[PDB]
Design a protein around this nucleic acid. Structure first.
Ligand SMILES: [K+]
Ligand SMILES: [K+]
Ligand SMILES: [K+]
Ligand SMILES: [K+]
Ligand SMILES: [K+]
Ligand SMILES: [K+]
Ligand SMILES: [K+]
Ligand SMILES: [K+]
Ligand SMILES: [K+]
Ligand SMILES: [K+]
Ligand SMILES: [K+]
Ligand SMILES: [K+]
Ligand SMILES: [K+]
Ligand SMILES: [K+]
Ligand SMILES: [K+]
Ligand SMILES: [K+]
Ligand SMILES: [K+]
Ligand SMILES: [K+]
Ligand SMILES: [K+]
Ligand SMILES: [K+]
Ligand SMILES: [K+]
Ligand SMILES: [K+]
Ligand SMILES: [K+]
Ligand SMILES: [K+]
Ligand SMILES: [K+]
Ligand SMILES: [Mg+2]
Ligand SMILES: [Mg+2]
Ligand SMILES: [Mg+2]
Ligand SMILES: [Mg+2]
Ligand SMILES: [Mg+2]
Ligand SMILES: [Mg+2]
Ligand SMILES: [Mg+2]
Ligand SMILES: [Mg+2]
Ligand SMILES: [Mg+2]
Ligand SMILES: [Mg+2]
Ligand SMILES: [Mg+2]
Ligand SMILES: [Mg+2]
Ligand SMILES: [Mg+2]
Ligand SMILES: [Mg+2]
Ligand SMILES: [Mg+2]
Ligand SMILES: [Mg+2]
Ligand SMILES: [Mg+2]
Ligand SMILES: [Mg+2]
Ligand SMILES: [Mg+2]
Ligand SMILES: [Mg+2]
Ligand SMILES: [Mg+2]
Ligand SMILES: [Mg+2]
Ligand SMILES: [Mg+2]
Ligand SMILES: [Mg+2]
Ligand SMILES: [Mg+2]
Ligand SMILES: [Mg+2]
Ligand SMILES: [Mg+2]
Ligand SMILES: [Mg+2]
Ligand SMILES: [Mg+2]
Ligand SMILES: [Mg+2]
Ligand SMILES: [Mg+2]
Ligand SMILES: [Mg+2]
Ligand SMILES: [Mg+2]
Ligand SMILES: [Mg+2]
Ligand SMILES: [Mg+2]
Ligand SMILES: [Mg+2]
Ligand SMILES: [Mg+2]
Ligand SMILES: [Mg+2]
Ligand SMILES: [Mg+2]
Ligand SMILES: [Mg+2]
Ligand SMILES: [Mg+2]
Ligand SMILES: [Mg+2]
Ligand SMILES: [Mg+2]
Ligand SMILES: [Mg+2]
Ligand SMILES: [Mg+2]
Ligand SMILES: [Mg+2]
Ligand SMILES: [Mg+2]
Ligand SMILES: [Mg+2]
Ligand SMILES: [Mg+2]
Ligand SMILES: [Mg+2]
Ligand SMILES: [Mg+2]
Ligand SMILES: [Mg+2]
Ligand SMILES: [Mg+2]
Ligand SMILES: [Mg+2]
Ligand SMILES: [Mg+2]
Ligand SMILES: [Mg+2]
Ligand SMILES: [Mg+2]
Ligand SMILES: [Mg+2]
Ligand SMILES: [Mg+2]
Ligand SMILES: [Mg+2]
Ligand SMILES: [Mg+2]
Ligand SMILES: [Mg+2]
Ligand SMILES: [Mg+2]
Lengths: 147, 187, 105
RNA sequence: CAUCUAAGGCUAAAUACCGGCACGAGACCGAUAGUCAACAAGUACCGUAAGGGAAAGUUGAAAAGAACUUUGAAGAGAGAGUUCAAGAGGGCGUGAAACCGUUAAGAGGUAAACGGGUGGGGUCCGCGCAGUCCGCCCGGAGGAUUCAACCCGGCGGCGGGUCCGGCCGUGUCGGCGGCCCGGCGGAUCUUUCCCGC
RNA sequence: GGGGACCGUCCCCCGACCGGCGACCGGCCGCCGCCGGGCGCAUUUCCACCGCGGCGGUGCGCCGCGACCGGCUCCGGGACG
RNA sequence: CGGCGACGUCGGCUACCCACCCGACCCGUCUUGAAACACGGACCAAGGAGUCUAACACGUGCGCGAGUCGGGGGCUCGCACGAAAGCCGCCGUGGCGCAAUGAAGGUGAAGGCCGGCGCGCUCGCCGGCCGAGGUGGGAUCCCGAGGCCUCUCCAGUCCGCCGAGGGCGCACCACCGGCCCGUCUCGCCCGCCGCGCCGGGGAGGUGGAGCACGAGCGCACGUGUUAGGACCCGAAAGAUGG
RNA sequence: CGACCUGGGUAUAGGGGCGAAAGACUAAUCGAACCAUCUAGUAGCUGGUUCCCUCCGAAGUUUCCCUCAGGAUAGCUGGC
RNA sequence: UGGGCCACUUUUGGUAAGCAGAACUGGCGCUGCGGGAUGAACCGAACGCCGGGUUAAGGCGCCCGAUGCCGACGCUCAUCA
RNA sequence: CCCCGCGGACGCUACGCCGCGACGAGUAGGAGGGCCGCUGCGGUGAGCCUUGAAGCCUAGGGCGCGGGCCCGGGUGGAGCCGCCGCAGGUGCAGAUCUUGGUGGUAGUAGCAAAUAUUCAAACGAGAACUUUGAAGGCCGAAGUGGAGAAGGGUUCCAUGU
RNA sequence: AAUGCCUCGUCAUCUAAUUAGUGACGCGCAUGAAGGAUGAACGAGAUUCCCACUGUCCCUACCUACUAUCCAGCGAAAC
RNA sequence: GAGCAGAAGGGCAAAAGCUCGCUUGAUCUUGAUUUUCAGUACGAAUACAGACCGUGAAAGCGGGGCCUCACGAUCCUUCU
RNA sequence: CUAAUAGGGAACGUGAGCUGGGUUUAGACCGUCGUGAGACAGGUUAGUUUUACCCUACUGAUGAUGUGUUGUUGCCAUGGU
């Protein structure tokens, strides 16, 4: 809505808010990111450190699919199965532990942030972090790898 | 003429909700009366929170509410939050909770009720505790927002750990001069 | 000029973009026109399936999608051989066939 | 090790469309706007040429477009007439401002003009011109039912152990009740009764 | 592959207790109110007129005057220490 | 309390003309400074200049919320409106968020207390519990000795108000610890179908846009910056083809 | 009476022509014609920038800049 | 916004400057009003629209509000006071 | 335990109403409010209107601090407005602004290069300028004469206005 | 010297009087050889003097034509 | 009142000066801080900490010059 | 020559008053400088001097206000000198 903007309030005011002395001129200071190493150096250094220069090795023909490895933490691990699955295992008399296939849920690597409920579980993943494996074995579970 | 400064005369504060939510306006009317006609400072705090913007009324996760409710001496007290209560899927055991909130997520509401809990709105809280007696007034993390990572000292200043605004994250995006000693300076 | 904190922006509007702008005001008309063609095609092949030939079961190539199965272009010649269907008869009875697909497993 | 088989050829659909033919529509513009062009407009006109390129819509419902008389050489007038209207008369709907003519009022040697304060005059306004209305009571002089209270009927408001139902909210049991005689879901278990190895 | 069992939400019912009839409604009662029709036909009630009537409110068609009270202010007399 | 009221007067500070007293230089603009011997402006009418798209940032409003979003497609008599609206759910592919760090190979965020033991060697095997530590502030909330009452007292029956002190402490702030990735220094152990120029672990500093019981996503509005003709008008020029 | 004057027909075209040479002339245009287009070329420079009331209310300073008629930066301002 | 300028005092260059350059506070710029006849900066004082009272700086022959006091004490004659 | 009286003002668009205290300069600039204003769209006003819409004019009556608005009178002759939302090509004194129109200047500058006109008559409403006659002059054959080229294109010739 | 600052160079001639002219001199700021130095004729070329001539002047006056001026008609512009 | 490399100022006497002896702390590292300052960078500097050393009997002192100046981003190249 | 041949101001008075000799455009020559284009408070030569009819000022020319109209003869405020 143009009726809600400053232009409707700047009618009758000669400089339209831009000022009498400095005026409103086309491009004082340059166009775009002009003078980032010259007359705009302080802004670029103050707010965008690292902007200028090369770092690291380039890699031609990067294929993002090859590096595809979504991760899930242990605190969210039991959300990949139904609530029926986890209550049944807890009240199960035997040592039967449910299987959580994180690849089926869309994750490849299991990370170890958080803590697990005290009940065994079999976790199937492409990759495991060291601490995720340790926490799964602490609750009596097992980690088995898939390809 | 008198020698004073007039730049601080008008205190900048919410005197009403900028929302046009008629249900929020109704319970603002209810708590405007309660704050005026009672000596309860609880009603004053609740009333001024009702004016607040959404960013000033952050959501309260179920885990945070449970953790504050589990502190000693808070048994059989009502958890009051002027905002949204959110399910936390990181918790596995929900205890019995008496809860008043402006708004409760459907999954969080089902979990609280299934655990034998009780959910109140602010109109029902007024009838239950008009002065707010036996309540625990909670708040979500006010600085739990992405904007606050960018606030503070400028990123290109020494001993500043504030997130810069970058369109992309990668080795080519603002990781060179001014970020490492090899590339001019680091600070 | 830069003004305080902000994102260094690089808009790609230096190349006379206004002379090549694709509006989508014909999108509702395009959806109608394709739907008429779909309905007309279905009537033309009256008992034959509207979608078309049966397509094979196909596993997606890369390590991102290789847990997912989709439909392929056509059944392989090896698939047709052990199914007992001639590669020239299959296209006449609604079986899509891809001569250039091999079966590694 | 994988993958294809160049240096020959064809092939519809999905896609594009500020030119063309024919259509439909619009939170667009409304005659200095919208196409340059609402009209004998790429016209008139300009330039040797390439090329440049306007302005310009509206009487009235109907011409019923002012017969006739009179002055003048005529333009132009005065009468008359048409019309609801010519205080609509062929560039004619409305008809602003700048500017001009005339009439009326007022004023005038410090250029006009202006702010504040009064005074004088003038045009108008005030149903101005013997200046409010209305509540109760008192007194006088007249009418009308019927005033209250009782009877009948109708309709409302409030209350009632639910007086009686119909309920509703929350639990409470047999589940009689659904995978045949009720559904939808579950990353929960199975033929150890049944169709492909 | 089915078909089953179980679990979670449901469903309409057969029924009781629980809080209430609620802003979900009816019937009966009780009280109150209104309306219509009778009766009541005059020390009641109501209507309009008059008084240069009284009490209240508002306000005087215009132009004026006075009085006391209170606020602010500028002055002037008298007396005491 | 008084006077006066219809063809002459009564009221109307507004509005028309005139008179007088006081005040009063022509606006706009640049500028330290304009009445300027600084520029533009004879007069009137109509036109006439911060817009739209995209991308960010922050604030505000709305919905849902560890999710969110169908915008591309498809299904609905194919169409007055309707080119709208509705629906999809094995259409959520995908985007953004839910994890960071390193150039990279890669790696990748849980602690506290109670016990027996090696030697409780700054320490390794377990048990049990609780589930992101602690200090100082901290709205609010909780307990609360003692007070406030009645025609009066020996003696408590029910709750209300004030209340010194004490307690749990939201958000947030300061600080101290802890955890993840990079990199140094020191050092000793452990694992095996590959006994390896193999793999893992510890302590102490330090680099990170991190963790430490999520806050985001979509839509709308405002402001600011930017690319676009870019608030409007303005060169001297350059190029192509005639 | 001459390197004379002049009509018409021809030829030379734009960074080209033609010049007894003045940067002269090349359709009133020449130290680079004219026409259309790129093109609404760019401008740190000049001029303008349209209703009312209310509230708050500056700076001409710091640092860096081929910076000195301009920006970035801190300061001063307002809003939430 | 990033052209400043002015005044008391301190202060550098210069013969000096309504010159040039600093320090400090205030001001003008951005500010009207009373006074200085007149005037960006001086003196007083800062401002919504008004009535009454009183002042500041400055004034009280006349212009022009106020000495039209029986004001006090002296000094001074100028043919450029 | 109100009752000889059966009765007892207003209020509270809560985005409303009421009370008390202090304060009020302002360029550049920022913000808020606008029952200020323009045009169009969705709703709404059982809205207005040929018994007169819009527009325009007005020594008419008023309202608002103001932007502006309402009403009377006239003209006009067919449409228009209020309120709740929505959306802009939305407000002018300037830009040596664009287009159009109009003033003062001003009945002014001016209608002065190449010697020159006069008398009578005719037609005619009308004669310094037309025609005829008479007279006086000029071009003076390198013409103010007679014919062509280029260019123009009907200007040629009669009659009429 | 159209080439010399100092410079109105110095001397002679021209005049009553000459920052002018001509003739002469030359350590010439900074002359000079395809251009130096001369030389008739020629020149809408620059300069000095003389005779004659004159309103250039002393020192202005008068006359003529067309205007301006006034009138009838017509009728702008700059600003 | 000398000298301490140089401009000047400060500092210094069994010193910081002069002469000998032995040496390489003018080495390898991580952070913090000061100066300019926006409290950005460079340069320079201060105090630590971890190595490896030098000197001295030792306490200690030393990671350049008694202190105040003596110097240089991105991109690229070269070496370790 | 003369009594004397004093010094100055008025936008270094006075260009819609003139003139255009000088300086100060474009042509050209010389000297010096410069590789060159070109330069020279060095010399030389040739080089468009536009408009008033507006307001005021001034110069002259009619008139205008008051004594009823109109005329004759006069006075002198003031200004010049
Ligand atoms: K602005
Ligand atoms: K604040
Ligand atoms: K046009
Ligand atoms: K056309
Ligand atoms: K008409
Ligand atoms: K001017
Ligand atoms: K869609
Ligand atoms: K998703
Ligand atoms: K990574
Ligand atoms: K823009
Ligand atoms: K052409
Ligand atoms: K010839
Ligand atoms: K050219
Ligand atoms: K400068
Ligand atoms: K700023
Ligand atoms: K700035
Ligand atoms: K409407
Ligand atoms: K108003
Ligand atoms: K009208
Ligand atoms: K020779
Ligand atoms: K000659
Ligand atoms: K530093
Ligand atoms: K040692
Ligand atoms: K290097
Ligand atoms: K005299
Ligand atoms: Mg302003
Ligand atoms: Mg303006
Ligand atoms: Mg401006
Ligand atoms: Mg005040
Ligand atoms: Mg203020
Ligand atoms: Mg047009
Ligand atoms: Mg029109
Ligand atoms: Mg005529
Ligand atoms: Mg009419
Ligand atoms: Mg007309
Ligand atoms: Mg008139
Ligand atoms: Mg200006
Ligand atoms: Mg100036
Ligand atoms: Mg001005
Ligand atoms: Mg001046
Ligand atoms: Mg100018
Ligand atoms: Mg103009
Ligand atoms: Mg002008
Ligand atoms: Mg307009
Ligand atoms: Mg749709
Ligand atoms: Mg996905
Ligand atoms: Mg704490
Ligand atoms: Mg810490
Ligand atoms: Mg910003
Ligand atoms: Mg170029
Ligand atoms: Mg433009
Ligand atoms: Mg242009
Ligand atoms: Mg530079
Ligand atoms: Mg300027
Ligand atoms: Mg400036
Ligand atoms: Mg400056
Ligand atoms: Mg100064
Ligand atoms: Mg100066
Ligand atoms: Mg200024
Ligand atoms: Mg100020
Ligand atoms: Mg002031
Ligand atoms: Mg004054
Ligand atoms: Mg004075
Ligand atoms: Mg006063
Ligand atoms: Mg005075
Ligand atoms: Mg007086
Ligand atoms: Mg103000
Ligand atoms: Mg506009
Ligand atoms: Mg205008
Ligand atoms: Mg004339
Ligand atoms: Mg003439
Ligand atoms: Mg002759
Ligand atoms: Mg001839
Ligand atoms: Mg003829
Ligand atoms: Mg000589
Ligand atoms: Mg002479
Ligand atoms: Mg030679
Ligand atoms: Mg050390
Ligand atoms: Mg002069
Ligand atoms: Mg002249
Ligand atoms: Mg002159
Ligand atoms: Mg000359
Ligand atoms: Mg010359
Ligand atoms: Mg040479
Ligand atoms: Mg000479
Ligand atoms: Mg000549
Ligand atoms: Mg004349
Ligand atoms: Mg005299």
């Amino acid at each position: 809505p143009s009726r809600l903007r400053k232009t409707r309030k700047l009618r009758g005011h000669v400089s339209h808010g831009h000022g009498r002395i400095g005026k409103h001129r086309k491009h004082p200071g340059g166009r775009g990111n002009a003078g980032g190493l010259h007359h705009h150096r302080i802004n670029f250094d103050k707010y965008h450190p690292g902007y200028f220069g090369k770092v690291g090795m380039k890699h031609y023909h990067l294929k993002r699919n090859q590096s595809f490895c979504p991760t899930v933490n242990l605190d969210k691990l039991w959300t990949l199965v139904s609530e029926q699955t986890r209550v049944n295992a807890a009240k199960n008399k035997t040592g039967a532990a449910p299987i959580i296939d994180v690849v089926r849920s869309g994750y490849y690597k299991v990370l170890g942030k958080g803590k697990l409920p005290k009940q065994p579980v079999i976790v199937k993943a492409k990759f495991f972090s060291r601490r995720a494996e340790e926490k799964i074995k602490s609750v009596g579970g097992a980690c088995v790898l898939v390809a | 003429g008198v020698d004073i400064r007039h730049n601080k005369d008008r205190k900048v504060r919410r005197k009403e909700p900028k929302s046009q939510d008629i249900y929020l306006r109704l319970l603002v009317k209810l708590y405007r009366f309660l704050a005026r006609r009672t000596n309860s400072t609880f009603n004053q705090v609740v009333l001024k929170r009702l004016f607040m913007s959404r960013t000033n009324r952050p959501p309260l996760s179920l885990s945070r509410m449970i953790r504050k409710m589990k502190l000693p001496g808070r048994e059989n007290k009502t958890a009051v939050v002027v905002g949204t209560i959110t399910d936390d899927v990181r918790v596995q055991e929900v205890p019995k909770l008496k809860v008043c909130a402006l708004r409760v997520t459907s999954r969080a509401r089902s979990r609280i009720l299934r655990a034998g809990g009780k959910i109140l709105t602010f109109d029902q809280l007024a009838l239950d505790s008009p002065k707010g007696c036996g309540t625990v007034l909670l708040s979500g993390p006010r600085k739990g927002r992405e904007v606050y990572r960018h606030f503070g000292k400028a990123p290109g200043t020494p001993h500043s750990h504030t997130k810069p605004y970058v369109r992309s994250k990668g080795r080519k995006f603002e990781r060179a001069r001014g970020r490492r000693a090899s590339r001019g300076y680091k600070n | 000029a830069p003004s305080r904190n902000g994102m260094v922006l690089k808009p790609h509007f230096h190349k006379d973009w206004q002379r090549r702008v694709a509006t989508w005001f014909n999108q509702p008309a395009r959806k109608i026109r394709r739907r008429k063609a779909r309905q007309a095609k279905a009537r033309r092949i009256a008992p034959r399936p509207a979608s078309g030939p049966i397509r094979p079961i196909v596993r997606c190539p890369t390590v991102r999608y290789h847990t997912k199965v989709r439909a392929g272009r056509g059944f392989s010649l090896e698939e047709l051989r052990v199914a007992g269907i001639h590669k020239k008869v299959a296209r006449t009875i609604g079986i899509s066939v891809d001569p250039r697909r091999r079966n590694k497993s």
